[PDB]
Design a protein around this ligand. Structure first.
Ligand SMILES: CCCCCCCCCCCCCCCCCC(=O)OC[C@H](COP(=O)(O)OCCN)OC(=O)CCCCCCCCCCCCCCCCC
Ligand SMILES: CCCCCCCCCCCCCCCCCC(=O)OC[C@H](COP(=O)(O)OCCN)OC(=O)CCCCCCCCCCCCCCCCC
Ligand SMILES: CCCCCCCCCCC1=C(C)C(=O)C(OC)=C(OC)C1=O
Ligand code: SF4
Ligand code: SF4
Ligand code: SF4
Ligand code: SF4
Ligand code: SF4
Ligand code: FES
Lengths: 197, 227, 584, 180
């Protein structure tokens, strides 16, 4: 159960599988996000970058001002109509492999701003790999999205070289986190009363 | 005719009563038992205003505006403190026996009693005793009956009997156990029984067909159509 | 007579002066709950009325606000002049500690007013926005071009007949705008941008690697010197005022949170105070103390962010990490109280959403013990550094005249020596019961002077938190008004009157009677004000939000001209703005 | 430039180096997510659930107050009725890609059915999977409000609760009764 860019099966010799696993390990353990500030969600992103959360521990603190060196585009903020061509150009300037995380309800769907000057979600014009609900998501939600992206990266198939082998990108069809956590979420009975601290 | 409401002069029709004359001017007087098609009977005592004998009068007197003619040179006040307190007290007295039913009531968001409870500014309950209850009747496939929500405004009986000419709906009982319905369970015989869902200012008579697939009034998409 | 009572303000000396100068029939006085004299002036007398107010013995020196209003759908205009549209001018006399609103009526076909840019230079962006969002022409304006929407935009979004919701997305328009952005540098004409005339042309934005947003500056350069610069703003326009015309009075509070996103409850405060003015609600003292608590906590949060951002813009990289740890402590307390971090939406019409949770004082005491040693460490590690002082002192300085003529409020105005804080001059929310000083500058507004004033404001907010912790009233967290939205939850859950009030207030909305109100507060970055027009309905007829970052960004070209580009970066870092506050 | 201010600047740089070194000798301020779980206060506004009454039935009466109080319009539901006459949601869906976690729906709920719970980990791979249906929202217990039961207060008759059996309710007096 994969997606080729069509639903196909897993294409994965045993040495090529080990090489692909090593490449995916190196890619997921070294993710360089692009420094792009749209709105309040970017403030929570850079809060995750600071000392009290330390996103550097996952190897994802090298925040690039150049889209060429960046691997991850975190659309963290509202996709305004004037800013949408800028977002598309900065996404186009990136290099393969590239991943996209929508952070916050604005980047997910437009959020509360179903208004004349807001594009209703960044998936309207760029492909998104991981969505985060929240307005804003807290910094550890951004960390959890980073681990979700790492798990998605570790099970995708990409060409090792541009001259040898199949050049198609096979992205795994992961189980939804809603269906995965439905076992533990429904079983919750009692929560702490809000009058305490 | 000429009236003076809260010190402001208004030109109205002298054949109307004070409540309909003031509602025609955009003034907000709470009311339950009066209807433009049924007339005035002065039951609910919600439409109280303060009437003065002349311009140089300070005491005044509480009158029911639905039962007071809009005669020429009539001096009244809606926003008088005594009239406001009496209208709030009438809403509170109606609220003493009312069921805690608004989330599970089909008249919520379309309720005249909700609108007038909010309009009087009455939102604090100082009644700590028990509330009366009633059994419900089966009125057929169209009208659902919920007698707890009644405020004894007598609109249903006046419409169904004096206006629609129906015979099987009536008022029974006494002092504070007044019941509005049929003498026994059965379908409402009138061909115009469905207008009870708009005549009743509360959730006693509701559209059962709508109550199957119920949604609130703010959630509807409406259009002006012809039957 | 309560503070929210409808006043005509005919006893104001400005009304008598206007009557003695222009005659009794030259204008109409409107009674409002705005707290200011509202005077409808004829259009042909607007310039001389503004000049007369500018030449008063204690003159109205600042144009606080200038915006339009579409009055075609307004039904309750009793006592008002006939107007399809109107333009209001809010002017402040600091010496009088007074303010006046002047309203000019406009017909639907004749939508043009004389420009106010000669009397007040900061009217330029306000008139550009009024033309952009209402189609109101300003005769004599130098460059009357759109400022929020792109230039190739049809219609005026703040009009009543303009559809508020998002249009259907099209890849064709995105591709066309990408091509326009690509050929913008090839076909740049420095005449449509308001510029004139070895003169290099450069674009700073639109994307910016910083925490105050992403906006574009077109720079005209003589070598390193900046000859002229205009800002391209509106890239972060969320249509918040149009959403004010689309939400109920209660459900608009989360939108007020996101005006400037470093403020939170500070942004909620003027809106709920203006709605309480419309509702006739006098909140109890515990409500005032709780709201002051949250406003000061978020003020400390925003000031820590601002000081860290300025230090990082200078070049030191560690104090932003430490002050983000301090922000985490503040966020722990705010999460405990409100349930959220930066957009709490906890203020209600008449009070706050919940009571204070049991144990909040321990977290407040922990933060109050944590903060001052960290602040002293920040000062001695970065703010006393001579390299930082060389990068900061003498950079983009201005006096009191430039701050007044450009509408500059907050730390810049007080760094020019003008002691004008809203919490002291025009007190709100029981700020008179707290003992705190207002730091002022020597008369020159450097980057460094603004930063040290914000440090002293942080210390004063810590003092306010100390007094609030030692003296906490016991009482209700909501007012006992019928228009308190929502009512207290336990009475809602067991009383039918309260259930009815809650039902109608959360669904259809609370009914604000037809009036106009206004609240001005001292926000984290300057003076933030809400001007609210109710047409008797459950939604706002008009929601005008005056933000200080708009005025500071308009002051940007008048203070950085003749300087370098690194000085421009430092000046951007020391202004304390966010682009959401600019565009809203 | 002056030699005195040069010496002052050199001393200030040395002092800054000294403070950063002593802060390197200090204690770490990092909370190690995900190995160290994040503490959330009990009224934290995260993932939305639907809760059950103490009797075990679902608390939602499908009154649609949360749906209209939502400023984003991301709550959709339909009222259905059982044979005893109690109201319940036929379906209940929340579009969490739109939800701003503002807590207005919990504030507007007159039965305390809809609640915002301390849970922030809701990231998804597909945006369609952020639409949570009723099977993803209804939990096994009462959540943050343990004892409130709306149907113990309401006037409608349901199973196990006839007329006059709610709180502060008298038994129904028939109009045919002999007492005056
Ligand atoms: C060997 C002898 C050379 C001739 C005598 C030199 C005297 C000392 C240098 C001098 O003239 O210093 C003053 C000069 C002032 O330069 P100014 O334009 O004011 O700008 C710098 C701001 N302080 O500042 C300078 O010129 C800058 C310092 C230059 C030092 C050069 C080496 C001097 C001898 C040791
Ligand atoms: C070579 C020696 C240079 C001069 C060293 C002594 C003077 C000095 O350090 O001056 C810099 C600074 C002056 O203090 P100041 O910035 O005015 O702050 C108020 C607190 N006295 O004082 C400080 O920053 C505090 C002292 C720092 C000393 C650093 C080590 C100097 C010797 C090596
Ligand atoms: C071509 C020039 C390259 C300079 C070095 C770039 C890579 C290191 C970035 C360091 C950094 C900076 C400045 C920084 O500001 C920051 O905060 C958002 C980080 O995350 C914690 C960083 O890692
Ligand atoms: S989702 Fe909320 S917090 Fe994030 S950018 Fe939008 S308004 Fe700001
Ligand atoms: S009739 Fe009106 S007041 Fe009574 S329960 Fe129904 S909606 Fe509420
Ligand atoms: S059933 Fe309705 S119409 Fe009849 S008296 Fe009662 S409230 Fe009035
Ligand atoms: S938290 Fe706010 S945005 Fe989310 S479903 Fe509830 S009311 Fe809607
Ligand atoms: S407000 Fe509560 S009871 Fe009403 S529909 Fe929503 S979750 Fe159900
Ligand atoms: S409306 Fe007049 S007493 Fe009922």
């Amino acid at each position: 159960d994969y997606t080729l860019t069509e639903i196909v099966t897993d294409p994965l010799n045993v040495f090529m599988g080990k090489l692909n696993d090593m490449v995916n390990w190196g890619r997921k353990n070294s993710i360089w996000p692009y420094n792009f500030g749209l709105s309040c969600c970017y403030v929570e992103m850079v809060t995750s970058f600071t000392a009290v959360h330390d996103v550097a521990r996952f190897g994802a603190e090298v925040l690039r001002a150049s889209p060429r060196q960046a691997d991850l585009m975190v659309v963290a903020g509202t996709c305004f109509t004037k800013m949408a061509p800028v977002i598309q150009r900065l996404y186009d300037q990136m290099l393969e492999p590239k991943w996209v995380i929508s952070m916050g309800a604005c980047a997910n769907s437009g959020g509360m701003y179903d208004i004349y000057s807001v594009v209703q979600g960044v998936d309207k014009f760029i492909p998104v790999d991981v969505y985060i609900p929240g307005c804003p998501p807290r910094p550890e939600a951004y960390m959890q999205a980073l681990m979700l992206l790492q798990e998605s990266i570790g099970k995708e198939r990409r060409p090792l070289s541009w001259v040898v082998g199949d050049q198609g990108v096979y992205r795994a069809n992961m189980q939804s986190e809603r269906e995965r956590k439905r076992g533990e979420r429904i079983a919750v009975t009692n929560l702490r009363t809000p009058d305490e601290i | 005719a000429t009236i003076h409401v809260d010190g402001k002069e208004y030109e109205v029709n002298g054949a109307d009563n004070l409540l309909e004359a003031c509602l025609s001017l955009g003034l907000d007087i709470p009311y339950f038992c009066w209807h433009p098609a049924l007339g005035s009977v002065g039951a609910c005592r919600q439409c109280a205003v303060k009437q003065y004998q002349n311009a140089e009068d300070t005491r005044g007197r509480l009158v029911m505006s639905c039962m007071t003619p809009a005669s020429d040179g009539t001096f009244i006040s809606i926003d008088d403190e005594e009239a406001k307190q009496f209208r709030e007290s009438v809403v509170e007295w109606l609220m003493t026996n009312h069921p805690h039913d608004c989330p599970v009531c089909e008249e919520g968001g379309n309720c005249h009693l909700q609108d007038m409870t909010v309009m009087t500014g009455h939102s604090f309950r100082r009644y700590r005793f028990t509330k009366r209850t009633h059994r419900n009747q089966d009125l057929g496939p169209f009208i659902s009956h919920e007698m707890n929500r009644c405020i004894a405004c007598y609109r249903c009986v006046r419409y169904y009997k004096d206006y629609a000419g129906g015979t099987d709906l009536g008022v029974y009982g006494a002092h504070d156990n007044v019941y509005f319905g049929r003498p026994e369970d059965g379908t409402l015989e009138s061909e115009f029984s469905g207008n009870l869902v708009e005549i009743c200012p509360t959730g006693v008579f509701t559209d059962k067909t709508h109550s199957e697939r119920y949604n609130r009034k703010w959630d509807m998409q409406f259009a002006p159509s012809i039957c | 007579e309560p503070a929210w009572q409808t006043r005509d303000h005919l006893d104001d000396p400005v009304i008598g002066e206007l009557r003695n100068r222009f005659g009794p029939d030259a204008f109409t006085v409107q009674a409002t709950r705005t707290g200011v004299p509202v005077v409808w002036i004829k259009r042909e007398q607007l310039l001389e009325v503004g000049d007369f107010l500018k030449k008063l013995p204690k003159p109205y020196v600042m144009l606080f606000d200038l915006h339009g209003m579409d009055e075609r759908l307004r039904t309750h205009r009793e006592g008002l002049p006939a107007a399809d549209f109107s333009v209001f001018y809010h002017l402040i006399s600091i010496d009088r500690n007074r303010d006046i609103m002047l309203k000019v009526a406009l017909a639907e076909n004749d939508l043009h007013v004389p420009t106010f840019t000669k009397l007040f230079p900061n009217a330029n962006w306000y008139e550009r926005e009024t033309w952009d969002l209402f189609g109101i022409t300003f005769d004599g304006h130098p460059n009357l071009r759109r400022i929020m929407m792109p230039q190739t935009w049809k219609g005026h979004p703040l009009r009543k007949d303009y559809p508020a919701r998002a249009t259907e997305f099209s890849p064709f328009e995105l591709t066309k705008a990408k091509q326009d952005l690509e050929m913008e540098a090839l076909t740049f004409k420095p005449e449509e941008w308001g510029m004139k005339r070895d003169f290099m042309f450069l674009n700073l934005g639109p994307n910016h690697p910083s925490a105050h947003g992403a906006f574009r500056i077109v720079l005209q350069l003589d070598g390193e010197e900046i000859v002229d610069c205009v800002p391209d703003i509106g890239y972060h326009h969320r249509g918040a005022e149009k959403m004010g015309e689309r939400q109920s009075w209660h459900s608009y509070i989360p939108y007020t949170d996101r005006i400037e996103y470093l403020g939170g409850c500070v942004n909620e405060m003027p809106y709920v105070l203006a709605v309480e003015k419309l509702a006739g609600i006098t909140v109890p003292d515990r409500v005032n103390v709780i709201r002051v608590m949250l406003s000061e906590l978020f003020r400390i949060n925003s000031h820590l962010l601002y000081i860290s951002t300025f230090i990082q813009d200078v070049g030191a990289m560690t104090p932003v990490f430490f002050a983000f740890t301090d922000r985490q402590k503040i966020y722990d307390l705010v999460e405990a109280i409100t349930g959220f971090r930066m957009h709490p939406a906890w203020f209600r019409i008449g009070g706050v959403a919940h009571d204070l949770p049991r144990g909040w004082d321990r977290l407040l005491r922990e933060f109050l013990d944590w903060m001052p040693k960290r602040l002293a460490s920040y000062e001695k590690a970065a703010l006393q550094n001579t390299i930082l002082k060389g990068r900061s002192q003498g950079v983009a300085a201005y006096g009191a005249k430039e701050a007044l003529e450009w509408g500059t409020t907050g730390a810049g105005l007080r760094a020019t020596g003008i002691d004008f804080d809203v919490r002291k001059a025009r007190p709100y929310s029981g700020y008179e019961n707290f003992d705190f000083e207002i730091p002022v500058g020597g008369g020159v507004s450097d980057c460094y002077t603004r930063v040290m004033l914000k440090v002293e404001e942080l210390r004063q907010s810590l003092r306010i938190l100390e007094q609030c912790l030692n003296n906490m009233p016991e009482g209700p967290f909501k007012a006992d008004h019928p228009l308190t939205t929502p009512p207290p939850k336990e009475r809602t859950l067991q009383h039918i009157e309260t259930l009815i009030t809650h039902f109608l207030q959360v669904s259809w909305g609370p009914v604000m009677p037809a009036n106009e109100s206004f609240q001005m507060i001292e926000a984290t970055k300057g003076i933030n004000s809400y001007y609210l027009t109710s047409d008797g309905s459950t939604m706002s007829y008009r929601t005008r939000i005056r933000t200080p970052s708009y005025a500071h960004l308009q002051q940007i070209p008048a203070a950085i001209r003749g300087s370098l580009v690194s000085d421009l970066i430092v000046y951007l870092g020391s202004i304390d703005f966010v682009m959401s506050d600019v565009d809203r | 430039m002056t030699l005195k201010e040069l010496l002052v600047g050199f001393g200030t740089q040395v002092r800054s180096i000294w403070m950063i070194g002593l802060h390197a000798f200090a204690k770490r301020e990092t909370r190690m997510y995900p190995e160290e779980p994040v503490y959330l206060p009990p009224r934290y506004r995260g993932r939305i659930v639907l809760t059950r009454d103490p009797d075990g039935e679902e608390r939602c009466v499908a009154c649609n107050l949360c749906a209209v109080a939502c400023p984003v319009g991301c709550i959709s539901l339909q009222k259905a009725e059982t044979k005893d006459g109690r109201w319940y949601p036929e379906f209940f869906r929340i579009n969490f890609s739109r939800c701003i976690f503002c807590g207005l729906c919990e504030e507007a709920c007159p039965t305390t059915a809809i609640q915002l719970t301390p849970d922030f980990e809701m990231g998804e791979y597909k945006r369609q999977d952020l639409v949570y249906e009723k099977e993803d929202l209804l939990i096994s217990g009462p959540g943050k409000y343990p004892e409130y039961n709306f149907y113990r207060m309401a006037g409608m008759a349901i199973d196990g609760k006839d007329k006059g059996e709610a709180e502060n309710e008298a038994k129904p007096i028939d109009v045919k009764s002999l007492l005056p």
